[PDB]
Design an enzyme around this catalytic site. Sequence first.
Site, PDB file in Angstrom:
ATOM      1  CB  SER A  48      37.691  36.199  64.372  1.00  0.00           C
ATOM      2  OG  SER A  48      36.383  35.651  64.314  1.00  0.00           O
ATOM      3  CG  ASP A  49      42.204  34.190  61.659  1.00  0.00           C
ATOM      4  OD1 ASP A  49      41.177  33.509  61.858  1.00  0.00           O
ATOM      5  OD2 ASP A  49      42.677  34.382  60.520  1.00  0.00           O
ATOM      6  CD  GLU A  66      48.832  32.975  57.282  1.00  0.00           C
ATOM      7  OE1 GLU A  66      47.734  32.438  57.540  1.00  0.00           O
ATOM      8  OE2 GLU A  66      49.364  32.934  56.149  1.00  0.00           O
ATOM      9  CE  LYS A  73      46.836  32.186  60.623  1.00  0.00           C
ATOM     10  NZ  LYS A  73      46.438  33.167  59.579  1.00  0.00           N
ATOM     11  CD  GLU A  75      46.747  35.538  55.272  1.00  0.00           C
ATOM     12  OE1 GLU A  75      46.736  35.705  54.034  1.00  0.00           O
ATOM     13  OE2 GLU A  75      46.063  34.662  55.845  1.00  0.00           O
ATOM     14  CD  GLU A 140      40.016  22.951  35.622  1.00  0.00           C
ATOM     15  OE1 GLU A 140      40.457  23.462  34.570  1.00  0.00           O
ATOM     16  OE2 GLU A 140      40.080  23.522  36.735  1.00  0.00           O
ATOM     17  CD  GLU A 144      40.193  14.876  40.061  1.00  0.00           C
ATOM     18  OE1 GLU A 144      40.515  15.495  39.024  1.00  0.00           O
ATOM     19  OE2 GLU A 144      40.905  14.852  41.087  1.00  0.00           O
ATOM     20  CE  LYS A 148      39.590  12.384  43.722  1.00  0.00           C
ATOM     21  NZ  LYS A 148      39.926  13.778  44.146  1.00  0.00           N
ATOM     22  CB  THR A 186      32.201  33.649  57.440  1.00  0.00           C
ATOM     23  OG1 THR A 186      33.060  32.695  58.078  1.00  0.00           O
ATOM     24  CG2 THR A 186      30.749  33.330  57.776  1.00  0.00           C
TER      25      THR A 186
HETATM   26  N1  LIG Z   1      47.127  38.749  48.324  1.00  0.00           N
HETATM   27  C1  LIG Z   1      46.622  38.933  46.946  1.00  0.00           C
HETATM   28  C2  LIG Z   1      46.884  37.789  46.163  1.00  0.00           C
HETATM   29  O1  LIG Z   1      47.051  36.564  47.099  1.00  0.00           O
HETATM   30  C3  LIG Z   1      47.220  35.317  46.336  1.00  0.00           C
HETATM   31  O2  LIG Z   1      47.328  34.215  47.256  1.00  0.00           O
HETATM   32  C4  LIG Z   1      46.141  33.903  47.854  1.00  0.00           C
HETATM   33  C5  LIG Z   1      46.198  32.453  48.409  1.00  0.00           C
HETATM   34  O3  LIG Z   1      47.109  31.601  47.617  1.00  0.00           O
HETATM   35  C6  LIG Z   1      46.663  32.639  49.652  1.00  0.00           C
HETATM   36  O4  LIG Z   1      46.407  31.574  50.483  1.00  0.00           O
HETATM   37  C7  LIG Z   1      47.268  31.664  51.635  1.00  0.00           C
HETATM   38  C8  LIG Z   1      48.267  30.510  51.583  1.00  0.00           C
HETATM   39  O5  LIG Z   1      48.979  30.523  50.362  1.00  0.00           O
HETATM   40  C9  LIG Z   1      49.250  30.610  52.761  1.00  0.00           C
HETATM   41  N2  LIG Z   1      50.201  29.503  52.693  1.00  0.00           N
HETATM   42  C10 LIG Z   1      48.498  30.539  54.092  1.00  0.00           C
HETATM   43  C11 LIG Z   1      47.338  31.532  54.207  1.00  0.00           C
HETATM   44  N3  LIG Z   1      46.496  31.117  55.335  1.00  0.00           N
HETATM   45  C12 LIG Z   1      46.451  31.654  52.949  1.00  0.00           C
HETATM   46  O6  LIG Z   1      45.693  32.845  53.103  1.00  0.00           O
HETATM   47  C13 LIG Z   1      44.351  32.635  52.732  1.00  0.00           C
HETATM   48  O7  LIG Z   1      43.826  31.394  53.347  1.00  0.00           O
HETATM   49  C14 LIG Z   1      43.332  31.517  54.798  1.00  0.00           C
HETATM   50  C15 LIG Z   1      42.608  30.347  55.154  1.00  0.00           C
HETATM   51  N4  LIG Z   1      43.435  29.177  54.895  1.00  0.00           N
HETATM   52  C16 LIG Z   1      42.422  32.768  54.904  1.00  0.00           C
HETATM   53  O8  LIG Z   1      42.074  32.942  56.276  1.00  0.00           O
HETATM   54  C17 LIG Z   1      43.116  33.983  54.402  1.00  0.00           C
HETATM   55  O9  LIG Z   1      42.202  35.138  54.499  1.00  0.00           O
HETATM   56  C18 LIG Z   1      43.523  33.850  53.010  1.00  0.00           C
HETATM   57  N5  LIG Z   1      44.288  35.117  52.591  1.00  0.00           N
HETATM   58  O10 LIG Z   1      45.854  33.971  50.174  1.00  0.00           O
HETATM   59  C19 LIG Z   1      45.856  34.797  49.152  1.00  0.00           C
HETATM   60  C20 LIG Z   1      44.523  35.549  49.054  1.00  0.00           C
HETATM   61  O11 LIG Z   1      44.587  36.803  49.718  1.00  0.00           O
HETATM   62  C21 LIG Z   1      48.421  35.373  45.444  1.00  0.00           C
HETATM   63  N6  LIG Z   1      49.678  35.172  46.282  1.00  0.00           N
HETATM   64  C22 LIG Z   1      48.576  36.640  44.661  1.00  0.00           C
HETATM   65  O12 LIG Z   1      47.777  36.570  43.436  1.00  0.00           O
HETATM   66  C23 LIG Z   1      48.222  37.896  45.387  1.00  0.00           C
HETATM   67  O13 LIG Z   1      49.279  38.196  46.306  1.00  0.00           O
HETATM   68  N1  LIG Z   2      52.453  20.732  36.898  1.00  0.00           N
HETATM   69  C1  LIG Z   2      53.641  21.189  37.649  1.00  0.00           C
HETATM   70  C2  LIG Z   2      53.336  22.374  38.352  1.00  0.00           C
HETATM   71  O1  LIG Z   2      51.816  22.376  38.670  1.00  0.00           O
HETATM   72  C3  LIG Z   2      51.351  23.581  39.383  1.00  0.00           C
HETATM   73  O2  LIG Z   2      49.911  23.549  39.445  1.00  0.00           O
HETATM   74  C4  LIG Z   2      49.450  22.567  40.266  1.00  0.00           C
HETATM   75  C5  LIG Z   2      48.062  22.957  40.828  1.00  0.00           C
HETATM   76  O3  LIG Z   2      47.965  24.425  40.971  1.00  0.00           O
HETATM   77  C6  LIG Z   2      47.204  22.501  39.905  1.00  0.00           C
HETATM   78  O4  LIG Z   2      45.982  22.180  40.447  1.00  0.00           O
HETATM   79  C7  LIG Z   2      45.048  22.019  39.364  1.00  0.00           C
HETATM   80  C8  LIG Z   2      44.010  23.137  39.424  1.00  0.00           C
HETATM   81  O5  LIG Z   2      44.637  24.400  39.361  1.00  0.00           O
HETATM   82  C9  LIG Z   2      43.018  23.002  38.255  1.00  0.00           C
HETATM   83  N2  LIG Z   2      42.011  24.053  38.351  1.00  0.00           N
HETATM   84  C10 LIG Z   2      42.327  21.634  38.275  1.00  0.00           C
HETATM   85  C11 LIG Z   2      43.328  20.479  38.288  1.00  0.00           C
HETATM   86  N3  LIG Z   2      42.605  19.220  38.480  1.00  0.00           N
HETATM   87  C12 LIG Z   2      44.392  20.622  39.394  1.00  0.00           C
HETATM   88  O6  LIG Z   2      45.350  19.601  39.177  1.00  0.00           O
HETATM   89  C13 LIG Z   2      45.749  18.968  40.370  1.00  0.00           C
HETATM   90  O7  LIG Z   2      44.616  18.785  41.308  1.00  0.00           O
HETATM   91  C14 LIG Z   2      43.710  17.564  41.062  1.00  0.00           C
HETATM   92  C15 LIG Z   2      42.919  17.310  42.216  1.00  0.00           C
HETATM   93  N4  LIG Z   2      42.166  18.509  42.541  1.00  0.00           N
HETATM   94  C16 LIG Z   2      44.573  16.318  40.718  1.00  0.00           C
HETATM   95  O8  LIG Z   2      43.699  15.306  40.209  1.00  0.00           O
HETATM   96  C17 LIG Z   2      45.604  16.596  39.686  1.00  0.00           C
HETATM   97  O9  LIG Z   2      46.426  15.378  39.527  1.00  0.00           O
HETATM   98  C18 LIG Z   2      46.478  17.711  40.032  1.00  0.00           C
HETATM   99  N5  LIG Z   2      47.406  18.004  38.839  1.00  0.00           N
HETATM  100  O10 LIG Z   2      47.877  21.139  39.276  1.00  0.00           O
HETATM  101  C19 LIG Z   2      49.172  21.215  39.469  1.00  0.00           C
HETATM  102  C20 LIG Z   2      49.670  20.001  40.255  1.00  0.00           C
HETATM  103  O11 LIG Z   2      50.360  19.118  39.384  1.00  0.00           O
HETATM  104  C21 LIG Z   2      51.780  24.867  38.743  1.00  0.00           C
HETATM  105  N6  LIG Z   2      50.813  25.215  37.616  1.00  0.00           N
HETATM  106  C22 LIG Z   2      53.169  24.882  38.198  1.00  0.00           C
HETATM  107  O12 LIG Z   2      54.120  25.138  39.285  1.00  0.00           O
HETATM  108  C23 LIG Z   2      53.547  23.633  37.479  1.00  0.00           C
HETATM  109  O13 LIG Z   2      52.706  23.524  36.325  1.00  0.00           O
HETATM  110 MG   LIG Z   3      44.147  33.783  57.298  1.00  0.00          MG
END
Ligand SMILES: NC[C@@H]1O[C@H](O[C@H]2[C@@H](O)[C@H](O[C@@H]3[C@@H](O)[C@H](N)C[C@H](N)[C@H]3O[C@H]3O[C@H](CN)[C@@H](O)[C@H](O)[C@H]3N)O[C@@H]2CO)[C@H](N)[C@@H](O)[C@@H]1O
Ligand SMILES: NC[C@@H]1O[C@H](O[C@H]2[C@@H](O)[C@H](O[C@@H]3[C@@H](O)[C@H](N)C[C@H](N)[C@H]3O[C@H]3O[C@H](CN)[C@@H](O)[C@H](O)[C@H]3N)O[C@@H]2CO)[C@H](N)[C@@H](O)[C@@H]1O
Ligand SMILES: [Mg+2]
Lengths: 252, 252
Positions: A48-49, A66, A73, A75, A140, A144, A148, A186
């Site tokens: 585990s990480d 990270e 690993k 984070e 959402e 969808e 598909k 988990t």
């Molecule tokens: N930390 C508290 C909150 O985190 C949010 O982001 C959340 C989410 O997008 C983010 O996701 C991040 C990614 O993005 C980033 N690019 C890689 C990283 N592995 C992943 O982290 C997450 O996904 C991993 C599994 N793949 C898990 O193992 C890990 O526990 C989890 N924190 O983890 C956060 C949850 O902890 C917002 N940034 C903000 O509302 C606030 O900072």
């Molecule tokens: N639209 C431009 C940018 O989009 C971002 O959000 C992105 C992403 O989080 C968001 O994801 C959203 C979700 O959240 C929401 N809960 C359900 C919705 N189907 C999904 O939308 C996305 O995922 C779908 C597949 N599962 C695709 O079918 C769909 O084309 C795609 N827009 O859609 C956006 C991608 O287009 C930010 N909001 C902002 O930086 C700016 O609005």
């Molecule tokens: Mg992680």
Amino acid sequence: NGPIIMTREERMKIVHEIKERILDKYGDDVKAIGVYGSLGRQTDGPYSDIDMMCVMSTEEAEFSHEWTTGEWKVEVNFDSEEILLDYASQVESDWPLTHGQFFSILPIYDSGGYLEKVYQTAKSVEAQKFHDAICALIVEELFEYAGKWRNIRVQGPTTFLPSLTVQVAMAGAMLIGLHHRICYTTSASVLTEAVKQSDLPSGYDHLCQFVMSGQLSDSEKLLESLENFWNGIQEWTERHGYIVDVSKRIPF
Amino acid sequence: NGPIIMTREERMKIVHEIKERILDKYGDDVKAIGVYGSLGRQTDGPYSDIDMMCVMSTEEAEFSHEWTTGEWKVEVNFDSEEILLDYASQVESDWPLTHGQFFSILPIYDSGGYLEKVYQTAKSVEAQKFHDAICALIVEELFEYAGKWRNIRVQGPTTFLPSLTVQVAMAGAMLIGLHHRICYTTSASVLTEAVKQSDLPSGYDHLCQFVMSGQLSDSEKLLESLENFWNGIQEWTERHGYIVDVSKRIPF
Ligand SMILES: NC[C@@H]1O[C@H](O[C@H]2[C@@H](O)[C@H](O[C@@H]3[C@@H](O)[C@H](N)C[C@H](N)[C@H]3O[C@H]3O[C@H](CN)[C@@H](O)[C@H](O)[C@H]3N)O[C@@H]2CO)[C@H](N)[C@@H](O)[C@@H]1O
Ligand SMILES: NC[C@@H]1O[C@H](O[C@H]2[C@@H](O)[C@H](O[C@@H]3[C@@H](O)[C@H](N)C[C@H](N)[C@H]3O[C@H]3O[C@H](CN)[C@@H](O)[C@H](O)[C@H]3N)O[C@@H]2CO)[C@H](N)[C@@H](O)[C@@H]1O
Ligand SMILES: [Mg+2]
């Protein structure tokens, strides 16, 4: 050479080394430090990480480190108290998988009960937020996916069907977890825990058996199972009051 | 029991109703309206949803309306020009799956070449951004998956392996798409298009064969295929320079 085998003791040393480094670098801006995830539950496996959270006092703090050493690993997430509390109280479609973090907090530094406050916030989210998340998930995501796999039935490709079936089973697990307002332990146990819960939509357990067994090569049985699960969802939503607005062509 | 069968002409009728509704409500705040997704490159299948985008003049505009009538689903995103362009120019790990939107925009309203400006921005992203995204992907996703399946081999559960294998194959598809700077057509074609590219890490196509065929019940062959893919990643990342310094225990 991927992650290596480590024991819980070695992980806690790394945890406390990182803790010291965080306090040396940021000092009095550090309100609290905790360990979450499997290491926080003390369930962590040999590979585990390490996941850690840090509450900062500096406003609008939101960053993360990270990295890997080639052998393990880590984070570490750094958030202000306000940013972390808003995140703990926001219910997205993957809440049952992400917010287990807040029910597995292992505190190692806390200057003012901040981690307890984050835990209280995460467990006192209003019931209406789970209701809205369920209705958003059906529109959402589930709706969808239904298009598909129905596209696959008429024009293919079937090579996407096993992956899409896994996604649907995972989304169904989220829907159940949102209903019961419970987070899964988990990632590996999400499906195992989902099928053991009450009030399952009809056809969900049958669909999950394909995903858990890995027997995802019979496209016809998968398509038939997806339709039964898709049908079972809508009586299930009426029975529990998760009613989706379908009355307008354009809702704005 | 939707989604239902629709023709392209029925979708464009719904699209232009929404366009009319958008211009009635927001008026001169609307800079441009386009259709993306499958309807955008007009490949759309009989069951596909409708995805639209709007460029607003309001500075902090960032909202969406996503709904269903029971028969079809529509998502309309409203973004300011600055917010939309910054999003088009940021490369995350799922860039190859999300940013195909910007290479399939069908303009139906555009008061000043805004949609062409979005296309130019999305296609002119600096190579360094794809390089960083690749290194982040290997750490934040691939390395974590390797620890998870190695835990499955030692302590289970085997019921997570088919789902985890699908996730690894999708992460590999992201890795390939980031390398070649290519976005995938639809969710259904991600795996088929990924395996047809050059410079694949050794073991990816063999791993995708399990996922595309749905033969995910031999955990033993899956773990061996995952390890082979994991080995191919380490040679593949060295040959292309996607090298991250891993020499420090704590890199901050
Ligand atoms: N930390 C508290 C909150 O985190 C949010 O982001 C959340 C989410 O997008 C983010 O996701 C991040 C990614 O993005 C980033 N690019 C890689 C990283 N592995 C992943 O982290 C997450 O996904 C991993 C599994 N793949 C898990 O193992 C890990 O526990 C989890 N924190 O983890 C956060 C949850 O902890 C917002 N940034 C903000 O509302 C606030 O900072
Ligand atoms: N639209 C431009 C940018 O989009 C971002 O959000 C992105 C992403 O989080 C968001 O994801 C959203 C979700 O959240 C929401 N809960 C359900 C919705 N189907 C999904 O939308 C996305 O995922 C779908 C597949 N599962 C695709 O079918 C769909 O084309 C795609 N827009 O859609 C956006 C991608 O287009 C930010 N909001 C902002 O930086 C700016 O609005
Ligand atoms: Mg992680």
